[PDB]
Each structure stands twice: as C-alpha cells, then as structure tokens.
Amino acid sequence: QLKNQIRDARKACADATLSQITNNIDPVGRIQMRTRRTLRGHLAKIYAMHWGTDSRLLVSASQDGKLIIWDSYTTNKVHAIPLRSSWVMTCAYAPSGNYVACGGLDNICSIYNLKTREGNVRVSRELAGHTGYLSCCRFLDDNQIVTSSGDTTCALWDIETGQQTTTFTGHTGDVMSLSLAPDTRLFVSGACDASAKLWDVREGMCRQTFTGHESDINAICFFPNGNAFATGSDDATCRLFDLRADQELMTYSHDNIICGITSVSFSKSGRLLLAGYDDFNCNVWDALKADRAGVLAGHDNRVSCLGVTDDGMAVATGSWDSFLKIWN
Amino acid sequence: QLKMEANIDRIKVSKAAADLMAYCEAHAKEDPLLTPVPASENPFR
Amino acid sequence: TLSAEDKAAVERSKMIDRNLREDGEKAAREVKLLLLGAGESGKNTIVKQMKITGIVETHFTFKDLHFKMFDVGAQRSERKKWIHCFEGVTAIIFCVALSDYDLVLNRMHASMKLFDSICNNKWFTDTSIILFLNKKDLFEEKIKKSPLTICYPEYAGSNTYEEAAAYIQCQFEDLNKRKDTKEIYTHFTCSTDTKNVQFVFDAVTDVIIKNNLKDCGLF
Amino acid sequence: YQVITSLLLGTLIFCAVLGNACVVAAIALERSLQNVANYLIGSLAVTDLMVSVLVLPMAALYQVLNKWTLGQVTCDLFIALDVLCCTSSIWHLCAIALDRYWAITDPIDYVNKRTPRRAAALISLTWLIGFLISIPPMLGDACTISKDHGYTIYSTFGAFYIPLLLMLVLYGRIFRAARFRIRKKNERNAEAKRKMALARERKTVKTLGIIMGTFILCWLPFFIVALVLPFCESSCHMPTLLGAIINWLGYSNSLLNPVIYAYFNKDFQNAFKKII
Ligand SMILES: C/C=C\C/C=C\C/C=C/C/C=C/CCCC(=O)O[C@H](COC(=O)CCCCCCCCCCCCC)COP(=O)(O)O[C@H]1[C@H](O)[C@@H](O)[C@H](OP(=O)(O)O)[C@@H](O)[C@H]1O
Ligand SMILES: CC(C)CCC[C@@H](C)[C@H]1CC[C@H]2[C@@H]3CC=C4C[C@@H](O)CC[C@]4(C)[C@H]3CC[C@]12C
Ligand SMILES: CC(C)CCC[C@@H](C)[C@H]1CC[C@H]2[C@@H]3CC=C4C[C@@H](O)CC[C@]4(C)[C@H]3CC[C@]12C
Numbered sequence: 001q002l003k004n005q006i007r008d009a010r011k012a013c014a015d016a017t018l019s020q021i022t023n024n025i026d027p028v029g030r031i032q033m034r035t036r037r038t039l040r041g042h043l044a045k046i047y048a049m050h051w052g053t054d055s056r057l058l059v060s061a062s063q064d065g066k067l068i069i070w071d072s073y074t075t076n077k078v079h080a081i082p083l084r085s086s087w088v089m090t091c092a093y094a095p096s097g098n099y100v101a102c103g104g105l106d107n108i109c110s111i112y113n114l115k116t117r118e119g120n121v122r123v124s125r126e127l128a129g130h131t132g133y134l135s136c137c138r139f140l141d142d143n144q145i146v147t148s149s150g151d152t153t154c155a156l157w158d159i160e161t162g163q164q165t166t167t168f169t170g171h172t173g174d175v176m177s178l179s180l181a182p183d184t185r186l187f188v189s190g191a192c193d194a195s196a197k198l199w200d201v202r203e204g205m206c207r208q209t210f211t212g213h214e215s216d217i218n219a220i221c222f223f224p225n226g227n228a229f230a231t232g233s234d235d236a237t238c239r240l241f242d243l244r245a246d247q248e249l250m251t252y253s254h255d256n257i258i259c260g261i262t263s264v265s266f267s268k269s270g271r272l273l274l275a276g277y278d279d280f281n282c283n284v285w286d287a288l289k290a291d292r293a294g295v296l297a298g299h300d301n302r303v304s305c306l307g308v309t310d311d312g313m314a315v316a317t318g319s320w321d322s323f324l325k326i327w328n
Numbered sequence: 329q330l331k332m333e334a335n336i337d338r339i340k341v342s343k344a345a346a347d348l349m350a351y352c353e354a355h356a357k358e359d360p361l362l363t364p365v366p367a368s369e370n371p372f373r
Numbered sequence: 374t375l376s377a378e379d380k381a382a383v384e385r386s387k388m389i390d391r392n393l394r395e396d397g398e399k400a401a402r403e404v405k406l407l408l409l410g411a412g413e414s415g416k417n418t419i420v421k422q423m424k425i426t427g428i429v430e431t432h433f434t435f436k437d438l439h440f441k442m443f444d445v446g447a448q449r450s451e452r453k454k455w456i457h458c459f460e461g462v463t464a465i466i467f468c469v470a471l472s473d474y475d476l477v478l479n480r481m482h483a484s485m486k487l488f489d490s491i492c493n494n495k496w497f498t499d500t501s502i503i504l505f506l507n508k509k510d511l512f513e514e515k516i517k518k519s520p521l522t523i524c525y526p527e528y529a530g531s532n533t534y535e536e537a538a539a540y541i542q543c544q545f546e547d548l549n550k551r552k553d554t555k556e557i558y559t560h561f562t563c564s565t566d567t568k569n570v571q572f573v574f575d576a577v578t579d580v581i582i583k584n585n586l587k588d589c590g591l592f
Numbered sequence: 593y594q595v596i597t598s599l600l601l602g603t604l605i606f607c608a609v610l611g612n613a614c615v616v617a618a619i620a621l622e623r624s625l626q627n628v629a630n631y632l633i634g635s636l637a638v639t640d641l642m643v644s645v646l647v648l649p650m651a652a653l654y655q656v657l658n659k660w661t662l663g664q665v666t667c668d669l670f671i672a673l674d675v676l677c678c679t680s681s682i683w684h685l686c687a688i689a690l691d692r693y694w695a696i697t698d699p700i701d702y703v704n705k706r707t708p709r710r711a712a713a714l715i716s717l718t719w720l721i722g723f724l725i726s727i728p729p730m731l732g733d734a735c736t737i738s739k740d741h742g743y744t745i746y747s748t749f750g751a752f753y754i755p756l757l758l759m760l761v762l763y764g765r766i767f768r769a770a771r772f773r774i775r776k777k778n779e780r781n782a783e784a785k786r787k788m789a790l791a792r793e794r795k796t797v798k799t800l801g802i803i804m805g806t807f808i809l810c811w812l813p814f815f816i817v818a819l820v821l822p823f824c825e826s827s828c829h830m831p832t833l834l835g836a837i838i839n840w841l842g843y844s845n846s847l848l849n850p851v852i853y854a855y856f857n858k859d860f861q862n863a864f865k866k867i868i
C-alpha cells in the first residue's frame with residue numbers, strides 16, 4: 001500500500017519533463033576530442049581509475065597486481081604499489097593524497113600510505129570484515145572510508161581503529177557501484193535489483209527508493225550540483241534520477257546500441273556527461289537534450305572506467321587493453 | 329521506515345528541472361570540455 | 374627542457390617501468406587454472422590431495438611447471454559479475470561427486486545445470502574443461518543399496534557399476550553444445566594421489582600443444 | 593615488346609612492395625601482434641621488402657635492356673646484395689620452421705622461456721649466414737654471378753640444400769606429432785569423431801602441402817639450374833625464356849611468402865580489418 005502511495009504521489013508530481021524546458025536550448029553540437037596523451041605501463045586489464053584533488057595525479061588499478069600513480073602532465077610514474085591479491089575490482093584516491101585504497105574479489109579494502117618518512121610505500125591498514133567480493137570502497141575524509149560489498153551490504157570504516165562503525169542492509173542483489181557526494185554528507189548505492197538506495201552517513205539508514213531499470217545497474221555518478229545522479233544499466237538505457245524530484249526524468253537510449261554500460265561520469269558544470277559502453281566506444285551524451293554529441297575511439301576490447309578531473313581540465317578513460325587515454 | 333520517509337518537503341519537478349538548467353548555464357563558461365580550449369593555455373600541449 | 378628535476382623524474386619513471394616489466398615477465402611464465410564445483414563435492418579433498426576469505430590462491434610445481442589454482446567456491450555470489458575476470462585461463466577443473474543421490478539440498482541436477490551454464494559461457498568458448506569424479510567407492514555402495522531410477526526417470530537398465538559410470542560420463546559429456554572448439558577431459562578420482570596431478574599436467578600439456586597447433590593451422 | 597614485359601615487371605614489384613609494406617606496418621602498429629613468431633614474420637617481411645626495393649628493380653632493368661649499362665662497380669653491389677638478401681629470406685623459412693617445431697614439441701619451453709631474444713638471435717644468425725655467403729666472392733657486358741665450381745657448390749649447399757633438408761625433417765616431425773595428437777548414442781559419437789578426425793587430417797595435410805610445395809616449386813628449379821649449368825661447359829644452349837622464367841620465380845616468391853605466412857592466418861587478417 002505504501003509503495004502504491006509513493007508511486008501515485010510521484011506520478012502526480014510528474015507534471016512536465018526536462019525535454020520541454022530544454023527544447024528551446026540550443027544543442028551543444030559536435031564535440032571533437034582526440035587522444036592527446038597515451039599511458040602504457042600496465043600489462044593486463046584495468047577496471048578502476050580515480051582522479052586526484054589537484055587534477056594532476058590519478059590512480060589506476062590493474063589485474064597484474066600493480067597500481068600506478070601517473071602524472072597527467074609529463075606522463076611519468078611517481079609510484080608503483082604491488083598488490084598481495086592480483087584480483088582488484090576498484091580503487092580510490094584520498095582527498096589529501098596521503099592514502100590509497102584497493103579492493104577486489106578478496107573481502108578486503110586495503111589502505112596504502114604514499115607519504116612517509118621512510119619514503120617507501122607500505123601497507124597502512126587491512127579492513128577485513130566483509131563476507132563477499134568488494135565492489136567500491138571510497139574515501140570520505142582522511143579518517144573515514146565507505147565500502148561496497150558483493151553480499152548486499154555497505155559499511156562505514158574508521159581507518160585507525162579498523163572496525164566498522166555503521167552497516168547497511170536491505171539489498172537482495174549485490175551492489176555494484178558507489179558514489180560520494182561533493183560534501184561527503186550522503187551517498188547513493190546501486191544493486192542488481194534494478195534499484196538504487198540513498199544512504200545517509202551521519203545517521204546510517206536508508207532514505208528513499210529509485211526504480212525503473214529492467215536489468216542490473218553497473219555505475220552511478222552524482223551530478224555536480226549534488227541533487228541528482230545518473231544510473232547506467234546493462235539494457236543500454238541510462239537513467240537520470242534527481243534527489244529532489246525523487247523520480248525518473250529522462251532516458252538515454254538509442255537503437256544502435258544493444259550492449260550495456262560500465263562507467264558513467266559528469267562534467268564540472270554537469271552540462272555534458274560521459275558513458276563507457278562495451279563497444280570500445282565512449283559516448284558524450286548531452287545532459288539536457290539527451291542526444292549524442294561526441295564519439296571517442298581508440299580502445300580494442302572494452303572500456304572499463306572513466307573519470308573527469310575536479311577542475312574539468314580533461315577526462316581520462318580506461319580499457320581492457322592496459323591503455324589509458326586522456327581526452328580533452 | 330517509510331512512515332518518516334513519506335513526510336518530506338515536496339517541490340515541483342519542474343522546479344527541479346529549472347534549477348538544473350540554471351546550474352548548467354551558470355558554470356558553462358568554466359567548462360574546458362564544452363568549449364575547445366586552444367593550445368595556448370591548454371597544459372596538455 | 375634543461376631541468377634537473379625533469380631528468381630525475383624521467384629516471385624514476387624508467388626505473389619503475391623496468392621493475393614493472395621484469396615483474397610482469399616473471400609472472401607471465403606461470404599457468405593459471407580455475408577450480409569450480411559444489412561446496413562439498415570433494416573440492417577441498419582434491420586441493421589437499423594435490424598439495425600432499427575469498428579467492429584461495431595455491432601454487433604448484435610439477436615437472437618444471439608452475440600452476441595457479443583459484444578456488445572461487447569459498448565465497449558464493451552471482452557468477453555473472455565475477456566469472457568474466459577469469460578469461461584466458463588454460464583450463465577449468467570441475468569437481469562433482471558420484472555419490473550425490475542420497476544427499477538432497479536434486480543435487481545431481483543442480484550440478485549438471487551449473488556445469489552446463491559454466492561450460493556454455495561466452496568467456497569460456499576456447500577454455501578447456503577438466504572434469505573430476507570423486508568418491509567412486511561410496512557411489513558403488515549407494516548403487517548396490519539404491520536403484521538408479523530415482524535420479525533418472527528417463528533411464529532404465531541394469532544396476533551395474535561400469536555401465537552406470539559410463540552412462541554418467543557420457544551424459545556429462547553430452548551437456549556441451551560446442552565440441553570442435555573445446556574438449557572435455559573426464560577422470561576417475563580414487564585413493565591414489567599422483568594420478569590426479571599427472572592427469573592434470575597431461576591435460577594442460579595437451580591443451581597447450583593443441584593451441585600451438587591451432588595457431589600453426591595444423592589442428 | 594619491351595613495354596609489354598616492363599609493365600608486368602612493374603606490377604610484380606609494385607604488388608610485392610605493397611604486400612611487404614602492409615605486413616610490416618600492420619605488425620608495427622598492432623600491440624596484439626607482438627609475438628615471438630610474429631617477430632620472425634616481420635623480419636621476413638622486411639627482408640622481402642629490401643629484396644623488392646633494392647634488387648628487383650635493377651634485375652628488371654637488366655632483363656628489359658638485356659645488358660648491364662651501370663658498370664662493374666654497380667654489378668658487384670647488385671650481385672652481393674642479391675645473394676645476401678635472397679639467402680637471408682630463404683633462411684627465415686627454416687628459422688620459422690624451427691620455432692614452430694620448438695613451440696609444438698616443447699610446450700614446457702614455450703611456457704617457461706620463450707622471449708623476443710630468441711627471435712632476435714635467430715634473425716641475427718640468418719643475417720650472419722647471408723653475409724657469409726655474400727662476402728667471400730668479393731674477398732676472393734653481362735652481370736653474371738661467379739660460376740666457380742667450389743664456390744657454386746658451397747653457396748648452393750649453404751643457401752638451399754642444407755635448409756631444404758633441415759626444413760623437410762622439421763615439418764615431418766611436426767606432421768608426425770600432429771597426427772599423434774589428432775588420432776589420440778554410439779552412432780552420434782562415432783560419426784562426430786570420424787568427421788572431426790577426417791577434417792583435421794585434411795586441414796593439416798593441406799596446410800603442410802601448400803607450405804612445402806610453394807617453396808619447392810618456386811626455388812628448387814633455380815638452384816638445380818645454378819648447380820647444373822656451371823658444371824657443363826660443353827652444353828650451354830638452353831632456351832633463354834626457360835632460364836629467365838626460372839630466375840624470376842625466385843624473385844616472384846617475394847610476394848608469395850607473406851601470403852603463405854602472414855595473410856592466410858585468421859589473426860593477421862583480423863588485425864587488417866581492425867586497422868582498416
Ligand atoms: C588439382 C586440384 C587440387 C589442387 C588445388 C585445388 C584444391 C586445393 C586448393 C589449394 C588452395 C589454393 C590457394 C588457396 C589457399 C586458401 O584456401 O587459403 C585459405 C583461405 O584464404 C583465402 O582463400 C582467402 C584469400 C586471402 C588472400 C589474402 C588477401 C591478399 C592477397 C593479395 C596479396 C598481395 C597484395 C598485398 C587459408 O589458408 P589455408 O587454406 O592454406 O589454411 C592455413 C594456411 O595454409 C596457413 O598458411 C595458415 O597459417 P600458416 O601455417 O603459418 O601458413 C593457416 O592459418 C591457414 O590459413
Ligand atoms: C632501404 C629501403 C629498403 C627502405 C627500408 C627502410 C626500413 C628499414 C624502415 C621502414 C619502416 C621502419 C620500421 C617501421 C616501424 C618499426 C616498428 C618499431 O617498433 C621498431 C622499428 C621499426 C621496425 C622500423 C625500423 C626501420 C624500418 C623497417
Ligand atoms: C621489443 C624488442 C625486443 C623487439 C625486437 C626487434 C629486433 C630484435 C629486430 C626487429 C628487426 C630486426 C632488424 C631488421 C633488419 C636489420 C638490418 C641488417 O642489416 C642487420 C640486422 C637488423 C638490424 C635486424 C636485427 C634485429 C631486429 C632489430
């Protein structure tokens with residue numbers, strides 16, 4: 001009954017769509033981008049990549065057991081952290097750049113320290129409390145870190161203590177992606193149930209429900225304003241959900257695409273968003289017109305991850321060919 | 329759970345769309361990806 | 374361009390690249406295998422036999438050849454979201470127990486369904502599968518004490534050991550739809566120890582030789 | 593009359609150069625083709641490209657003009673380069689055969705130790721042999737190669753006959769191994785096994801037959817002529833057209849080796865499709 005009431009309320013609140021408002025807005029037009037830098041240091045597939053706070057250093061994890069921190073200017077390597085477990089599915093970069101995180105099939109989001117008196121990278125913490133393969137553990141501050149597991153749960157961890165403070169439960173399918181808001185006050189998580197849960201860090205409980213997809217969802221990214229986020233699924237129909245409207249707004253679908261999506265990201269102003277499909281091509285979807293404005297090529301097998309700099313100066317994408325392409 | 333979640337300040341969806349459009353047009357000048365930055369000030373040259 | 378710090382950074386990058394390349398070369402010349410099966414079908418028994426909380430990586434050394442076995446059955450989850458990462462494995466080791474009729478979680482049907490799903494996976498088209506049958510003795514007593522009609526409504530025949538074993542073997546070999554690309558290697562596991570390792574090594578060598586011949590176009 | 597043959601020769605060298613350049617470019621620009629065997633194939637393509645760019649045009653000019661107008665200084669360089677490049681191209685086939693034999697019959701070595709240094713050493717050895725076959729005559733109106741009996745026999749045995757047997761034996765062993773591997777309700781299994789066995793046997797037989805027969809029928813006549821003519825001074829009235837065709841068969845092999853080794857295999861044409 002309550003679900004029916006919520007559905008009726010959201011349907012009633014749906015008086016108009018963004019298409020009508022954006023109809024008079026001129027399209028962004030053709031966005032031409034070319035690979036201006038090529039980083040070839042990895043030797044196996046890579047599934048994660050995160051930009052730095054200064055828009056200079058970025059961290060990427062691969063399946064060969066090595067993590068490389070690259071310089072976006074000189075295409076040089078500053079560090080190389082070997083991994084005890086060769087299976088890593090995610091990575092994160094600390095806001096201050098003092099710590100790094102890595103997680104994968106092993107139920108651990110290991111924490112690595114970059115700056116030390118000795119000057120040699122070493123293991124900082126080993127958070128091992130989950131019972132399933134990890135999906136995405138992201139830093140909140142230098143003291144707190146969230147974790148997404150493959151056993152329908154998400155927990156908040158304190159770095160120094162090592163014991164989780166809060167645990168989230170209620171999912172039926174394993175959660176695949178996790179994104180943090182700019183203010184680090186709340187976050188939203190997605191699961192294979194074709195639904196997403198909004199979670200509040202301070203209190204530690206769910207707030208509101210999103211549905212609409214027919215298959216699993218693989219990626220989520222918050223709008224720069226922080227009041228909306230876009231969800232990608234295996235049906236090739238990305239959906240944008242607003243934390244204010246609490247209802248689906250538009251769909252990014254095209255008959256020419258039948259393959260799913262892997263990663264999504266937004267721009268600095270949120271006018272355009274990136275999408276990494278399984279056709280070794282990234283589509284520069286327009287946030288307003290929901291049209292296709294740019295085509296990116298140069299990947300052999302598949303695009304696994306992509307992220308935009310905080311300054312918006314450039315965007316980096318990762319593929320299963322161990323090649324990182326820096327687009328601008 | 330749902331009882332407290334229901335009680336929330338409800339604003340028009342069109343208001344949210346207008347706010348999103350305003351945010352998009354507010355910072356459109358500072359988008360290097362949107363407007364092609366010339367190689368003079370582009371650090372990728 | 375005439376900067377000492379730039380030269381130092383380039384030297385550091387070159388050293389890092391050298392370390393990465395040498396480590397990758399070291400880690401390339403080692404075979405990677407996969408282990409799949411039910412929770413209590415004898416997988417851990419096989420692991421113990423060969424060597425005597427997620428992925429359990431165990432290293433073997435047999436006749437100058439290193440094997441990496443990834444026991445993924447420790448953690449249970451949706452196979453679609455972590456099975457694609459195991460592409461390129463030389464072979465897949467499948468463990469199923471003959472004496473699974475008494476235990477009901479039906480078990481034989483679930484094992485056959487799992488085998489059919491994994492074998493016909495899009496990521497394992499070129500991957501060879503090694504099938505191991507465990508606890509043959511217990512199966513012998515079970516057939517001597519129980520009929521074979523309960524498990525197979527569509528099968529009727531003599532309640533003998535060799536014929537039943539052959540029937541099970543061929544029925545398992547019939548699940549696969551494609552046969553020209555991959556070849557399944559069935560084996561009988563007994564109290565012996567070296568036989569299993571020898572069979573695994575022979576299967577890996579045969580797979581490597583056949584892959585080389587295919588690359589050469591002679592197979 | 594001259595133009596009729598000149599156009600055909602121009603087309604021959606043009607297509608040979610195009611094929612070799614395409615093979616080299618595809619190998620260079622592809623990161624998935626950086627294999628040990630592909631390195632040998634690329635070295636063979638480079639040698640064939642050198643043959644097509646340096647030697648073939650001057651040979652065609654000599655063929656069409658029927659005389660050497662570039663002088664003895666150029667004749668010596670032409671002869672030396674022809675001998676060196678042809679020997680290097682011939683020995684690359686045997687090097688590839690040895691690499692395939694090692695890969696097939698020694699899987700342990702393939703898995704453990706097979707690095708690009710092996711291909712580099714093989715290429716260096718082939719080039720060293722080619723040089724050793726080209727410098728001796730220099731250190732010892734027709735631009736004819738030296739016809740000394742001892743030098744002739746030594747060069748022929750070091751260029752064709754030695755690799756001929758070292759290649760026949762290797763592919764014989766490879767065929768035996770392939771046959772051993774292939775050979776090792778009831779109606780369905782029996783028919784499937786029979787079909788698979790017959791198809792695989794036909795495939796391997798066809799591949800080996802093509803590989804050996806092309807090389808044989810394209811080189812053996814030339815070396816037979818080279819080994820027979822200098823030892824019979826009394827009888828040298830052979831038809832000119834037959835000799836010209838036999839000599840040009842070796843040059844024409846330049847555009848055949850990449851087709852046999854590079855274009856036929858599914859991965860290389862897939863790379864061509866990807867780049868195209
Ligand atoms: C008496 C009656 C019986 C005798 C004769 C009749 C019956 C028998 C016929 C004999 C065959 C005649 C020649 C045709 C061979 C043929 O069928 O080619 C097959 C299909 O390709 C195409 O045809 C497609 C063609 C692709 C060509 C590449 C495109 C570019 C060509 C121009 C290049 C010049 C410009 C650059 C493939 O070649 P294949 O059939 O020979 O099979 C193998 C081949 O032998 C191996 O070389 C190759 O690897 P290798 O061992 O290292 O050498 C293998 O991968 C595989 O290709
Ligand atoms: C003198 C006449 C015959 C022209 C031939 C020039 C040759 C030597 C040129 C043309 C193209 C060049 C190659 C093209 C690209 C590669 C791939 C690279 O990773 C190593 C060098 C290598 C192999 C180059 C070396 C020299 C090269 C082979
Ligand atoms: C990643 C590295 C190891 C790739 C290895 C490629 C090297 C070993 C290969 C590619 C092409 C080869 C060269 C091509 C042709 C020539 C010209 C000849 O007159 C002397 C040998 C020389 C110079 C070859 C030696 C080896 C060579 C340089």
Ligand SMILES: CC(C)CCC[C@@H](C)[C@H]1CC[C@H]2[C@@H]3CC=C4C[C@@H](O)CC[C@]4(C)[C@H]3CC[C@]12C
Nearest residue numbers: 797798799800801802803805806807808809810
């Ligand atoms: C020398 C160059 C110019 C011409 C080459 C002609 C080639 C294509 C001819 C020569 C003899 C022929 C082969 C002789 C017999 C066999 C064995 C048979 O079971 C399949 C066909 C096969 C393999 C033939 C294929 C084509 C063949 C290889």
Ligand SMILES: CC(C)CCC[C@@H](C)[C@H]1CC[C@H]2[C@@H]3CC=C4C[C@@H](O)CC[C@]4(C)[C@H]3CC[C@]12C
Nearest residue numbers: 597600601604655833836837838840841844845
């Ligand atoms: C099968 C293909 C691809 C390769 C072989 C093509 C052969 C037959 C071609 C290539 C060049 C040609 C020769 C080039 C020039 C001469 C010299 C002239 O005085 C008589 C004809 C003769 C001898 C031509 C006859 C045919 C020829 C030998």
Ligand SMILES: NCCc1c[nH]c2ccc(O)cc12
Nearest residue numbers: 674675678679747748751818
């Ligand atoms: N074009 C083939 C030249 C060549 C290569 N090797 C040879 C050996 C002997 C000879 O007379 C000639 C040659």
